[PDB]
PDB file of N, CA, C and O in Angstrom:
ATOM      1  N   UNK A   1     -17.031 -36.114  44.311  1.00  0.00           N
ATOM      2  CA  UNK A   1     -17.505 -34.969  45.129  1.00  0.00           C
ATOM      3  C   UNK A   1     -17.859 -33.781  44.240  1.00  0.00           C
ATOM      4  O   UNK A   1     -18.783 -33.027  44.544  1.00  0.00           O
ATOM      5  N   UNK A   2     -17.029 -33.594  43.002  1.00  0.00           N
ATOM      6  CA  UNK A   2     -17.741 -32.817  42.037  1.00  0.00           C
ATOM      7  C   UNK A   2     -18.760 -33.109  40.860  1.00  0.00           C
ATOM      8  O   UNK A   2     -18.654 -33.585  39.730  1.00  0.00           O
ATOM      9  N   UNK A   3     -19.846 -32.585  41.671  1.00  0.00           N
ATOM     10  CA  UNK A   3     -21.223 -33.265  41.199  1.00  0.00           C
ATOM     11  C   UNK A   3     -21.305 -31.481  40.298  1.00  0.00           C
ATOM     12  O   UNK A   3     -22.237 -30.754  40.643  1.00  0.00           O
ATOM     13  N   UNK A   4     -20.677 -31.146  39.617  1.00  0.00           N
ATOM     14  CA  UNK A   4     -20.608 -29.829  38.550  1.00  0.00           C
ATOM     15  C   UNK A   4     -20.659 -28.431  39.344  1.00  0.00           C
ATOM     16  O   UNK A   4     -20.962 -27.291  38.992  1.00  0.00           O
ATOM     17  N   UNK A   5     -20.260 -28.962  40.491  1.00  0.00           N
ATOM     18  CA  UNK A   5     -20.161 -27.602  41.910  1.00  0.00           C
ATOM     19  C   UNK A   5     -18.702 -27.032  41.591  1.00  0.00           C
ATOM     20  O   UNK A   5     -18.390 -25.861  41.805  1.00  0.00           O
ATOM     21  N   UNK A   6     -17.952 -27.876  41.121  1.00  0.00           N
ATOM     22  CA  UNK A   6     -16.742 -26.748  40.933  1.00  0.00           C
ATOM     23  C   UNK A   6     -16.358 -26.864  39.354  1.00  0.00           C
ATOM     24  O   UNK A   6     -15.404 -27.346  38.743  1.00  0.00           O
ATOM     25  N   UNK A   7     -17.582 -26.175  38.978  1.00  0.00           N
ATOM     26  CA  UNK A   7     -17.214 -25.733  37.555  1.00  0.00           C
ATOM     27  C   UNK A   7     -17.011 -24.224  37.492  1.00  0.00           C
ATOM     28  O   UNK A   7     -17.885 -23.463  37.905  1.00  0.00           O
ATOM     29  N   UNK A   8     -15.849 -23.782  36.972  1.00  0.00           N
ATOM     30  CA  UNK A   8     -15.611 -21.990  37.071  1.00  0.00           C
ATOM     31  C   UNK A   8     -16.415 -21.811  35.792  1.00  0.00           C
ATOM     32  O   UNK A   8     -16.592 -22.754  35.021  1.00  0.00           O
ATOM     33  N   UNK A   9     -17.134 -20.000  35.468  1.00  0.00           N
ATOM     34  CA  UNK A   9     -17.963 -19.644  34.777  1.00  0.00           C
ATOM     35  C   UNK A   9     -16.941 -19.332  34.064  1.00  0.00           C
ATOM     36  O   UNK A   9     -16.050 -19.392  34.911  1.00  0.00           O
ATOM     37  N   UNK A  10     -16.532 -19.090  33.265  1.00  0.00           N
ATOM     38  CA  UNK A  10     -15.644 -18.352  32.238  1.00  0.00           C
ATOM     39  C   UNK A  10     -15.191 -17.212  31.961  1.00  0.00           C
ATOM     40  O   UNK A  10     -15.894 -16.858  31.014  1.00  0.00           O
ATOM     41  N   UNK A  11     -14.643 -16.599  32.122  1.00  0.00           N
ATOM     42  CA  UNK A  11     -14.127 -15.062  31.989  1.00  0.00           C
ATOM     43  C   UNK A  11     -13.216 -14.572  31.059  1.00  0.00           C
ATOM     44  O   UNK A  11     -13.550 -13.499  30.557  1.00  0.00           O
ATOM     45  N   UNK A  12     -11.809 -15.208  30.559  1.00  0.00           N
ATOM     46  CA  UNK A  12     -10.932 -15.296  30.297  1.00  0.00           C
ATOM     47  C   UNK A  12     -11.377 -15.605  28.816  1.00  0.00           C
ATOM     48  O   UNK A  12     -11.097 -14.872  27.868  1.00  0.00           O
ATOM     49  N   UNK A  13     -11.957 -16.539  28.744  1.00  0.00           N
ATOM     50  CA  UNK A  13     -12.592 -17.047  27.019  1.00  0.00           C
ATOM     51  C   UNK A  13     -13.889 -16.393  26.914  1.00  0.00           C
ATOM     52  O   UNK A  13     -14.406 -16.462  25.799  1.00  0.00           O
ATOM     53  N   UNK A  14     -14.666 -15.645  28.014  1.00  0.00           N
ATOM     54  CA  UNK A  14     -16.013 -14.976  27.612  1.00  0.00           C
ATOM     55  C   UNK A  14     -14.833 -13.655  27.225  1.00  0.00           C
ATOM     56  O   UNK A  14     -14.621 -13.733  26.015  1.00  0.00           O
ATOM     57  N   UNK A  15     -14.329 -12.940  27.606  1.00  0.00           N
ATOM     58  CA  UNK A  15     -13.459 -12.058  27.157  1.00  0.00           C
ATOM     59  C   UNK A  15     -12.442 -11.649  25.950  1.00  0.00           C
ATOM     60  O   UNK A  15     -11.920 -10.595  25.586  1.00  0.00           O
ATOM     61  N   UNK A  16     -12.416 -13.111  25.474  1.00  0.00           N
ATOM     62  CA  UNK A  16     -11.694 -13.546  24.173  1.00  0.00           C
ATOM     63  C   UNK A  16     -12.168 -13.417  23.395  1.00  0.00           C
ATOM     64  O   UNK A  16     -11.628 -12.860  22.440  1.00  0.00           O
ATOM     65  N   UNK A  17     -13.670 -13.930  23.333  1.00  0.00           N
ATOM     66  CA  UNK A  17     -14.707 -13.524  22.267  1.00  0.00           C
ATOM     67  C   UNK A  17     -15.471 -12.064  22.102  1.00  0.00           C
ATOM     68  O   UNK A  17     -16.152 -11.725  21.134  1.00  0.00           O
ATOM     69  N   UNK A  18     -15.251 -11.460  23.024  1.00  0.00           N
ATOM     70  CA  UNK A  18     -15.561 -10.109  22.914  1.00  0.00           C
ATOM     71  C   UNK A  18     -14.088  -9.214  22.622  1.00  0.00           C
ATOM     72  O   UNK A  18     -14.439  -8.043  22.478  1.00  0.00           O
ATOM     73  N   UNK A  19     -13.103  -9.286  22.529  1.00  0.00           N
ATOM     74  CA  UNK A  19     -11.795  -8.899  22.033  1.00  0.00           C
ATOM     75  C   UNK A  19     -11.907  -9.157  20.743  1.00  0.00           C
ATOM     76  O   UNK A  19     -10.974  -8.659  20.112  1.00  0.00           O
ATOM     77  N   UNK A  20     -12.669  -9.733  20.093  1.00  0.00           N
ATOM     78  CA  UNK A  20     -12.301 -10.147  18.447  1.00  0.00           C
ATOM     79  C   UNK A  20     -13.263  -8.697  17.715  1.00  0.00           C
ATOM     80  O   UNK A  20     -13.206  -8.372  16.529  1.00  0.00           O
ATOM     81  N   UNK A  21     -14.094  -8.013  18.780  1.00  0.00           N
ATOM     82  CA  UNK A  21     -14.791  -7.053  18.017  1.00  0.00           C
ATOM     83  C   UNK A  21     -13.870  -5.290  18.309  1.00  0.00           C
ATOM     84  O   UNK A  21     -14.260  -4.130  18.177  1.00  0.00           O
ATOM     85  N   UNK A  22     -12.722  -5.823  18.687  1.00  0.00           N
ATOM     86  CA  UNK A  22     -11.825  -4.517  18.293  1.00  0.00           C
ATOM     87  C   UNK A  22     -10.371  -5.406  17.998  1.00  0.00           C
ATOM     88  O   UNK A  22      -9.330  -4.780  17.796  1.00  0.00           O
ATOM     89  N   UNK A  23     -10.382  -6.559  17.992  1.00  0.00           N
ATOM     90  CA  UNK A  23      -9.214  -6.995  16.708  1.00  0.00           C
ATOM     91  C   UNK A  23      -9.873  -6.790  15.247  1.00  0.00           C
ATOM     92  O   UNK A  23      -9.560  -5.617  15.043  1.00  0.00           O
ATOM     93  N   UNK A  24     -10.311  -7.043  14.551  1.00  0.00           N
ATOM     94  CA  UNK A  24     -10.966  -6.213  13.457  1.00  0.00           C
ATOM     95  C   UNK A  24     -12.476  -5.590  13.300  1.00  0.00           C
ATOM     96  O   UNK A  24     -13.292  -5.687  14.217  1.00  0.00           O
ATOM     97  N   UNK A  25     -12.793  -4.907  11.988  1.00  0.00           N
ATOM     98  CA  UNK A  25     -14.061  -3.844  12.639  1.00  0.00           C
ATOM     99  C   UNK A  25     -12.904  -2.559  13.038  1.00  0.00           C
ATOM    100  O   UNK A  25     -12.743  -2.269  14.223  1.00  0.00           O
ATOM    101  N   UNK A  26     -12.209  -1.907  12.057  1.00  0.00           N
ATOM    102  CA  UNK A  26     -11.551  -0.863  12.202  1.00  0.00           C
ATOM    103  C   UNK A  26     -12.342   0.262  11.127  1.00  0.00           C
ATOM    104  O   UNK A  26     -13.111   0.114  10.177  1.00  0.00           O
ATOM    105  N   UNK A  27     -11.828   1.256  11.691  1.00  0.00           N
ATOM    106  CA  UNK A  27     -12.698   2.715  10.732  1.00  0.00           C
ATOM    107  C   UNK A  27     -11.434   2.523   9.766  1.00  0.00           C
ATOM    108  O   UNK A  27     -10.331   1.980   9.828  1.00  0.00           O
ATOM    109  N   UNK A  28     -12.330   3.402   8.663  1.00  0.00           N
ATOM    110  CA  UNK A  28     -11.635   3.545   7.272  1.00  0.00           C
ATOM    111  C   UNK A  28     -10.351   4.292   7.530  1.00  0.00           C
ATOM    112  O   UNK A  28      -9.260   3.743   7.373  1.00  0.00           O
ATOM    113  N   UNK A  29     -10.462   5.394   7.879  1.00  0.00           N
ATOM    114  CA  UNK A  29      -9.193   6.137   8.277  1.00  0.00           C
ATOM    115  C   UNK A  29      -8.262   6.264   8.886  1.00  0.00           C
ATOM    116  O   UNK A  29      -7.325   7.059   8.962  1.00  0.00           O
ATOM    117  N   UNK A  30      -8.796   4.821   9.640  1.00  0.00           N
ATOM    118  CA  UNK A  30      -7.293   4.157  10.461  1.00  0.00           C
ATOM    119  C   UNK A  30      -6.731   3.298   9.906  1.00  0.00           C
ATOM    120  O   UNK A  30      -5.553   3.095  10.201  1.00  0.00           O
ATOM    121  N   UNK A  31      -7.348   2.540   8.963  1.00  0.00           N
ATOM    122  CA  UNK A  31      -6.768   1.335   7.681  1.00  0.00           C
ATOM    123  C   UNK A  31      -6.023   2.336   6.565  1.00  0.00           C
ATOM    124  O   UNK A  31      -6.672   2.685   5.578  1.00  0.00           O
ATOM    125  N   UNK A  32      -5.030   2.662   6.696  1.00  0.00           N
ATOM    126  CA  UNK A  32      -4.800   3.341   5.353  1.00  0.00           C
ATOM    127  C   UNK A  32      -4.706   2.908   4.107  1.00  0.00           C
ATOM    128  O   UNK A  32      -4.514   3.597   3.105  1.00  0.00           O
ATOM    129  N   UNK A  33      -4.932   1.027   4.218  1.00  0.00           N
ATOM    130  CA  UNK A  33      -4.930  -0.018   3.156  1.00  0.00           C
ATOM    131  C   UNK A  33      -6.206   0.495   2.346  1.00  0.00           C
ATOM    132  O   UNK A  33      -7.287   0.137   2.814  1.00  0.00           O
ATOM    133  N   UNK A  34      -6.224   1.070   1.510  1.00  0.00           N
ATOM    134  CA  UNK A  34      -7.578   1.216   0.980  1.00  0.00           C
ATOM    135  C   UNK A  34      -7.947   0.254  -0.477  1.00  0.00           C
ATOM    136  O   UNK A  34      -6.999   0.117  -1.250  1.00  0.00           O
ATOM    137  N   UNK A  35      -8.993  -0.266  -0.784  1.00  0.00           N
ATOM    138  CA  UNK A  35      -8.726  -0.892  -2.220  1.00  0.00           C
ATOM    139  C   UNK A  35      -9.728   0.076  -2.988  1.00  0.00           C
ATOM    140  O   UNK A  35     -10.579   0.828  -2.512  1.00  0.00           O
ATOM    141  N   UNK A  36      -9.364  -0.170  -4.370  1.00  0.00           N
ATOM    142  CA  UNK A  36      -9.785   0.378  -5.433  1.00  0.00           C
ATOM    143  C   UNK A  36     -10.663  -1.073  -6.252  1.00  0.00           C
ATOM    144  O   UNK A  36     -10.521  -2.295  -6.210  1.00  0.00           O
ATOM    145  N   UNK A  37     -11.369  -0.350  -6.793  1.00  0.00           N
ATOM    146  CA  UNK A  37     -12.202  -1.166  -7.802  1.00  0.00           C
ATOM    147  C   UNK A  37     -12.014  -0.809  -9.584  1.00  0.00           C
ATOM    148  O   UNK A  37     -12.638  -0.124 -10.394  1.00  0.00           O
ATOM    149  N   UNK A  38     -10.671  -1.783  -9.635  1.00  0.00           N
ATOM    150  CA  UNK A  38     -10.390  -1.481 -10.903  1.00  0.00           C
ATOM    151  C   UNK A  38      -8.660  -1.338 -10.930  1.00  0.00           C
ATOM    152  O   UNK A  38      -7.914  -1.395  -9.952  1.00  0.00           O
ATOM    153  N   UNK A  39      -8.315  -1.152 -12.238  1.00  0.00           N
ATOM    154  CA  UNK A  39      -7.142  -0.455 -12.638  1.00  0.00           C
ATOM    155  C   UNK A  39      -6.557   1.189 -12.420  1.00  0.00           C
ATOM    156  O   UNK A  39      -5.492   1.646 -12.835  1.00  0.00           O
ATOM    157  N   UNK A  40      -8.045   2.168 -11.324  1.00  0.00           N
ATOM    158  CA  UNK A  40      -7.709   2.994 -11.644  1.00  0.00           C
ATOM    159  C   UNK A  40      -6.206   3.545 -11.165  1.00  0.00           C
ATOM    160  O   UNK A  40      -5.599   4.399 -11.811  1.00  0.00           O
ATOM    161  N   UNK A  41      -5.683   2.925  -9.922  1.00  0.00           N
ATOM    162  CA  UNK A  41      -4.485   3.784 -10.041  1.00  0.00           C
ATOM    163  C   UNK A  41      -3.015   3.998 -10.495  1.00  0.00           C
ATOM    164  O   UNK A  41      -2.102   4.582  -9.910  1.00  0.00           O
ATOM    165  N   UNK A  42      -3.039   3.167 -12.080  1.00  0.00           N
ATOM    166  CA  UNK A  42      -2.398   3.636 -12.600  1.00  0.00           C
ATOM    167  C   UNK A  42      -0.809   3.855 -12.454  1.00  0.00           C
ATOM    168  O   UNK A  42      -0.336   4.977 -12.636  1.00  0.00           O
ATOM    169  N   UNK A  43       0.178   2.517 -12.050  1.00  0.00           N
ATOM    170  CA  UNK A  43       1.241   2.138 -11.918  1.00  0.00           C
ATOM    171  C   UNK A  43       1.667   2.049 -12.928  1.00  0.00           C
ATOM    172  O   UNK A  43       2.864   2.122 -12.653  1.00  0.00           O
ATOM    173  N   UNK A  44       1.600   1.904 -14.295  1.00  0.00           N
ATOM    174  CA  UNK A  44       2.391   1.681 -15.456  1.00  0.00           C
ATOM    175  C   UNK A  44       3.282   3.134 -15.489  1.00  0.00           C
ATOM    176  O   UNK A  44       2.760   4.152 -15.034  1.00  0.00           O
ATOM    177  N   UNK A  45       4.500   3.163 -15.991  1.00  0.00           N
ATOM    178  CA  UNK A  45       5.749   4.316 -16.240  1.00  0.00           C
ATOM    179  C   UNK A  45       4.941   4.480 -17.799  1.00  0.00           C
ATOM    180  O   UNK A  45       4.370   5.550 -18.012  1.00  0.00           O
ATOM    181  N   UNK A  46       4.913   3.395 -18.873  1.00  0.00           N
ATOM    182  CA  UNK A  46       4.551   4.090 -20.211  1.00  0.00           C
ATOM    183  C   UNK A  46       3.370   5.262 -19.983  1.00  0.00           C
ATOM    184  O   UNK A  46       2.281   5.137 -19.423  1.00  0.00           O
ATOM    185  N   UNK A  47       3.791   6.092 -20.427  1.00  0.00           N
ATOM    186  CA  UNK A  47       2.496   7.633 -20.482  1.00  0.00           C
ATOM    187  C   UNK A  47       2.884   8.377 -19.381  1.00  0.00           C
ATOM    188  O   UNK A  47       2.646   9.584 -19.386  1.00  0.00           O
ATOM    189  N   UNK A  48       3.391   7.909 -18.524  1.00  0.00           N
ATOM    190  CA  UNK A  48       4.074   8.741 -17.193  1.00  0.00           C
ATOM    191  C   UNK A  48       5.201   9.802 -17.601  1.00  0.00           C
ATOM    192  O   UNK A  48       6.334   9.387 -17.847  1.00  0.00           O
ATOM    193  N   UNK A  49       4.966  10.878 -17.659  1.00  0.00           N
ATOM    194  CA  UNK A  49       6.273  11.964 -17.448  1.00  0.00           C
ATOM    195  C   UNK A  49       5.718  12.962 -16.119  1.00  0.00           C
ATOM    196  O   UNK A  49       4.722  13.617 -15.809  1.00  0.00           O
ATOM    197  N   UNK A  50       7.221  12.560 -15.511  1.00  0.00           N
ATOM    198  CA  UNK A  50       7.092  13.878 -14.247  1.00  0.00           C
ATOM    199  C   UNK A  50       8.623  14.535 -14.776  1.00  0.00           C
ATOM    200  O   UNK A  50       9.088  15.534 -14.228  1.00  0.00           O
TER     201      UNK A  50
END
């Protein structure tokens, strides 16, 4: 009797895939993870005096 008449449209998984564009895709200034390109910041103690 189901000749593809009771197929539901999707909502739940059309919704899932549009949730992944504010699970990541964050602004810079809310990531406070920032990377550097390089060695510049400078963790070694030798040369360090505070």
């Amino acid at each position: 009797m189901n000749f593809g008449a009771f197929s539901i449209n999707p909502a739940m998984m059309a919704a899932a895939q549009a949730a992944l564009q504010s699970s990541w895709g964050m602004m810079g200034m809310l990531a406070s993870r920032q990377n550097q390109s390089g060695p510049s910041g400078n963790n070694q103690n030798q040369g360090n005096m505070q």
